[PDB]
């Protein structure tokens, strides 16, 4: 380990602590860069060596956090909570939380090594038919999004969940135990309590539950409307109009957003096709076009363009050489104020264009706070980081903006078109809310011990049925580990940030649309080229995590807390139209036949 990274001696008061933080931030950048660098080398090129090197960097990060956490505890443990500087209090409190650095060396290794193997299992798992084999991205993704054959969707869903989940379960149990051991020594009951602490809100869970209560009626009506369409397509044998929807029919491996079945549920298919994918292909869009168009939206707001290091270093397409990569999209900050990259196996589709904006939102954030000290190089909270790119994508997806960028012949500003659009947006945003809420409900119960290995799948499907109103299309038992077939579980990425951001982004949109001078319906707003909006947004991004998110938020939108009303205001028209459609069809809202599962196809898996 480098002496130049080990902590110096500082006076045991706030003045010495202010110098202590500078020296910490100084050396942390070198440590963070070598960790990010090695993760990148592995994720863009999965090999045992790159895994080894990634784990060495992880160990080194842990030695660094140990030394500096120790020093901080011996110097300021009794006095840092009383400092006047609140940003210093933030920094110090962070440094004294050692996480996996609380582990002994032998368990530090095992922990670092589980992450490598869980990541490899997920990102290299394949579904084989009988020579060739399908990967999740693009093969199974495209099947789930476009196939309307019940048996083919089933084969892809079952094959994926079996291939990814079953091998992960034994590893995930070991990881959970080690993670908990680590964070207990920081004073957390369990890792989940640490994750939740990032929101600095004593009533976090209660506040989330109250939000979900306001949003659930919207989901239930969307659910019932979509269920009716699936009933017509697949028959009474496979769809129960009073039961949960089979989990493989909603356009997505995790049933988590439904925009890919828009063409099965669009009420007015004569009107312009608001899925512009066919046009993007007809026009010959490529990955680089998509990132350049996203970039230009950011620069239209007088935010920063992507630096040369981004274009030279990013991986914007799935490699064609015989290489295995983590295709799950990600945005990378190397903590050197120079290098920022996206790794995305970009496909030419409309929902990938949204993803491009999402990931570039992360980069923009990185660029706007790169001069802050490291500990503040985060979103106000993790939900803020996830909302930035999605907010811009709300403007991009409006039919008026799509027209501006040549992807849609201008649509009539009528009601059939307004409903078509808000419905597509509901499929993308409202359908996600139960899933965004339930994933960390599951993981919080695993970390707390409420959900032992013996109930991993039982409790996962309890939650999936409770919240999303779906059911597995084949029988599952505790040999299956269906939570593990979702990227964020083996890759240990928390999820509640996405529930937070799916609500928050509509608060941001409203603030920015009002600040842009817009006045029509909130869902037709396009903040493109509004430099006033760009300024309001730029203030948030530069704040990093220096001020409480409740303060940053108050400055931007007028409230200091999450609020569903902007979301509700955005969807008002289709919320009403959906209720009417379901009443006219005599739908039951919900899934009272909660035990119901569909039958197998006759010749399955044959033919």
Ligand X SMILES: *[C@@H]1O[C@H](CO[C@@H]2O[C@@H](C)[C@@H](O)[C@@H](O)[C@@H]2O)[C@@H](O[C@@H]2O[C@H](CO)[C@@H](O[C@@H]3O[C@H](CO)[C@@H](O)[C@H](O)[C@@H]3O)[C@H](O)[C@H]2NC(C)=O)[C@H](O)[C@H]1NC(C)=O
Ligand Y SMILES: *[C@@H]1O[C@H](CO[C@@H]2O[C@@H](C)[C@@H](O)[C@@H](O)[C@@H]2O)[C@@H](O)[C@H](O)[C@H]1NC(C)=O
Ligand Z SMILES: *[C@@H]1O[C@H](CO)[C@@H](O[C@@H]2O[C@H](CO)[C@@H](O)[C@H](O)[C@H]2NC(C)=O)[C@H](O)[C@H]1NC(C)=O
Tokens encoding 125: 């798992």
Is 399 an interacting residue with respect to Cl ion (CB under 5 A)?
no
Pick 124 or 524: Cβ nearer ligand X: 524
CA–CA distance, 571 with 511 (Å, rounded to integer): 16
239 contacts ligand D0W (rule: CB under 6 A): no
The catalytic position among 14, 55, 359, 515 is 359
Q: What string marks each residue from 384 to 423 as x (binds Zn ion by CB under 5 A) or -?
A: --x-------------------------------------
Beta bridge partners of 341: 332
Nearest to 492 by CA among 188, 105, 112, 167: 112
Residue 572 binds ligand X (CB under 6 A): no
Distances (CA, A) of 561 to 207, 225, 389, 549, 566: 9, 32, 20, 9, 12
Q: Is 289 a catalytic residue?
A: no
Residue 480 is a catalytic residue:
no
Q: From the list ligand D0W, Zn ion, ligand Y, none, which binds 332 (C-beta under 5 to 8 Å, kind-based)?
A: ligand D0W
Instruction: List the interface residues with ligand D0W, window 336-355 (CB under 6 A).
Output: 354-355
* Site map 479..498 versus Cl ion, x via CB under 5 A: ---------------x--x-
Phi, psi of 7, rounded to the nearest 5 degrees: -75, 140
| Alpha-helical segments (H) within 333-484 | 350-368, 382-396, 399-404, 415-429, 432-448, 456-463
| 331 counts as binding ligand D0W under rule CB under 6 A | yes
Q: What six digits make up the tokens of 522?
A: 């909130």
Task: Report whether 196 belongs to an annotated binding site.
Answer: no
Nearest CA-CA partner of 311 in 347, 345, 339: 339
Q: Which residue's Cβ lies closest to Zn ion?
A: 386
**β-strand partners of 315:** 343
Footprint (CB under 6 A) of ligand X, residues 412-471: 413-415, 418
User: By C-alpha distance, which of 43, 107, 554 is closest to 328?
Assistant: 43
Instruction: Name the DSSP letter for residue 139.
Output: I
Q: Which residues of 96-124 are buried (b: 16+ CB within 10 A; e: fewer)?
A: bbbbbbbbeeeebeebbbbbbbbbbbbbe
The entry of Zn ion, ligand Y, Cl ion, none that residue 497 binds, CB within 5 to 8 Å by partner kind: Cl ion
Q: Which is nearer to Zn ion, 386 or 428 (CB)?
A: 386
User: Is residue 443 involved in binding ligand D0W (CB under 6 A)?
Assistant: no
* C-beta closer to ligand Z: residue 325 or 500: 325
Question: Is 362 marked as a binding-site residue?
Answer: yes
In the block, which residue shows the tokens 């032992």? 452
Q: Is the dihedral of CA 95, 99, 100, 104 positive or negative?
A: positive
Q: Which stretch binds Zn ion (CB under 5 A): 129-137, 379-387, 418-426, 506-514?
A: 379-387
Q: What is the DSSP letter of 315?
A: B
Q: Does 505 bind ligand D0W (CB under 6 A)?
A: no
Evaluate whether 244 touches 598 at the Cβ level (below 8 Å).
no
Query: What is the contact mask toward ligand D0W in residues 464 to 503, using x (rule: CB under 6 A)?
Result: ----------------------------------x-----
- Alpha carbon 564 to its chain centroid, in Å, reads 19
Question: With contact defined as beta carbons under 8 Å apart, do 180 and 190 qualify?
Answer: yes
Active-site annotation holder among 216, 488, 593, 597: 488
Q: What share of the chain is helix, strand, coil (3-state, %, to 5)?
A: 60, 5, 35
Which does residue 300 touch among ligand X, Zn ion, ligand Z, none (CB within 5 to 8 A, set by kind)? Answer: none
Q: How far apart are CA 62 and CA 219, in angstroms?
A: 43
Please answer whether residues 403 and 411 qualify as being in contact, where contact means their C-beta atoms are separated by less than 8 angstroms: yes
497 is in an annotated binding site: yes
Instruction: Candidates 351, 359, 515, 587: give the one binding Mg ion (CB under 5 A).
Output: 351
289 is in an annotated binding site: no
Task: Pick one of 132, 477, 584, 603: the residue that binds ligand Y (CB under 6 A).
Answer: 477
Give min distance, CB of 244 to ligand Y, in A. 18
**521 is a contact residue toward ligand X (CB under 6 A):** yes
351 binds, among ligand D0W, ligand X, Mg ion, none (CB under 5 to 8 A by kind): Mg ion
Q: From the CB of 141, what's the least distance to Mg ion, in Å?
A: 8
Binding partner at 323 among Cl ion, ligand Z, ligand X, none, C-beta below 5 to 8 Å by kind: ligand Z
Which residues would be at the binding site for ligand D0W (CB under 6 A)? Answer: 256, 328-332, 354-355, 358-359, 362, 385-386, 390, 498
Binding-site residue ranges for chloride? 199, 497
Binding-site residue ranges for Zn(2+)? 358, 362, 386
Which residues would be at the binding site for ligand Y (CB under 6 A)? Answer: 474-475, 477, 479
Catalytic annotation, residues: 359, 488
Which residues would be at the binding site for Cl ion (CB under 5 A)? Answer: 382, 494, 497
């Amino acid at each position: 380990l480098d002496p130049g990274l080990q902590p110096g001696q500082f006076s045991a008061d706030e003045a010495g602590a202010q110098l202590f933080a500078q020296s910490y931030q100084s050396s942390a950048e070198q440590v963070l860069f070598q960790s990010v660098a090695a993760s990148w080398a592995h994720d863009t090129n999965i090999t045992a060596e790159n895994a080894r090197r990634q784990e060495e960097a992880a160990l080194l990060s842990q030695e660094f956090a140990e030394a500096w956490g120790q020093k901080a505890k011996e110097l300021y443990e009794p006095i840092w909570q009383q400092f006047t500087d609140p940003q210093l209090r933030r920094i110090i409190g962070a440094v004294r939380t050692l996480g996996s650095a609380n582990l002994p060396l032998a368990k530090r290794q095992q922990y670092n090594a589980l992450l490598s193997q869980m990541s490899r299992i997920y990102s290299t798992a394949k579904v084989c038919l009988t020579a060739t084999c399908w990967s999740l991205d693009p093969d199974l993704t495209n099947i789930l999004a476009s196939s309307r054959s019940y048996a083919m969707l089933l084969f892809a869903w079952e094959g994926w969940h079996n291939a990814a989940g079953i091998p992960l379960k034994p590893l995930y149990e070991d990881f959970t135990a080690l993670s908990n051991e680590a964070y207990k020594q920081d004073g957390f009951t369990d890792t989940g309590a640490y994750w939740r602490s990032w929101y600095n809100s004593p009533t976090f869970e209660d506040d989330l539950e109250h939000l979900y209560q306001q949003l659930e009626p919207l989901y239930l009506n969307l659910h019932a409307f979509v269920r009716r369409a699936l009933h017509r397509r697949y028959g009474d044998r496979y769809i129960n109009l009073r039961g949960p929807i089979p989990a493989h029919l909603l356009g997505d491996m995790w049933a988590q957003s439904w925009e890919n079945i828009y063409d099965m549920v669009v009420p007015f298919p004569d009107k312009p096709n608001l899925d512009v994918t066919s046009t993007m292909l007809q026009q010959g869009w490529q990955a680089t076009h998509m990132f350049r168009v996203a970039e230009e939206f950011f620069t239209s707001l007088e935010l920063s363009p992507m630096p040369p290091e981004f274009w030279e270093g990013s991986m914007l397409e799935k490699p064609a050489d015989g290489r295995e990569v983590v295709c799950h999209a990600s945005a990378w900050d190397f903590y050197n104020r120079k290098d920022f990259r996206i790794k995305q196996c970009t496909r030419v589709t409309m929902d990938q264009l949204s993803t491009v904006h999402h990931e570039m939102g992360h980069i923009q954030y990185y660029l706007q706070y790169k001069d802050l000290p490291v500990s503040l190089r985060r979103g106000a909270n993790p939900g803020f980081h996830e909302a930035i790119g999605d907010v811009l994508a709300l403007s991009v997806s409006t039919p008026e903006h799509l027209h501006k960028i040549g992807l849609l012949d201008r649509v009539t500003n009528d009601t059939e078109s307004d409903i078509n659009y808000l419905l597509k947006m509901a499929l993308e945003k409202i359908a996600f809310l139960p899933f965004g809420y339930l994933v960390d409900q599951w993981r919080w119960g695993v970390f707390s011990g409420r959900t032992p290995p013996s109930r991993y799948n039982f409790d996962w499907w309890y939650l999936r049925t409770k919240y999303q109103g779906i059911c597995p299309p084949v029988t599952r038992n505790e040999t299956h580990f269906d939570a593990g077939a979702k990227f964020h579980v083996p890759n240990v990425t928390p999820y509640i940030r996405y529930f937070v951001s799916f609500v928050l982004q509509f608060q941001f949109h409203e603030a920015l649309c009002k600040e842009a001078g817009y006045e029509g319906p909130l869902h037709q707003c396009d903040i493109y080229r509004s430099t006033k909006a760009g300024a309001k947004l730029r203030k948030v991004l530069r704040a990093g995590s220096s001020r409480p998110w409740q303060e940053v938020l108050k400055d931007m939108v007028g409230l200091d807390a999450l609020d569903a009303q902007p979301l509700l205001k955005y969807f008002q028209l289709v919320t009403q139209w959906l209720q009417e459609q379901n009443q006219q069809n005599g739908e039951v809202l919900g899934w009272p036949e909660y035990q119901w599962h569909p039958p197998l196809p006759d010749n399955y898996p044959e033919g």
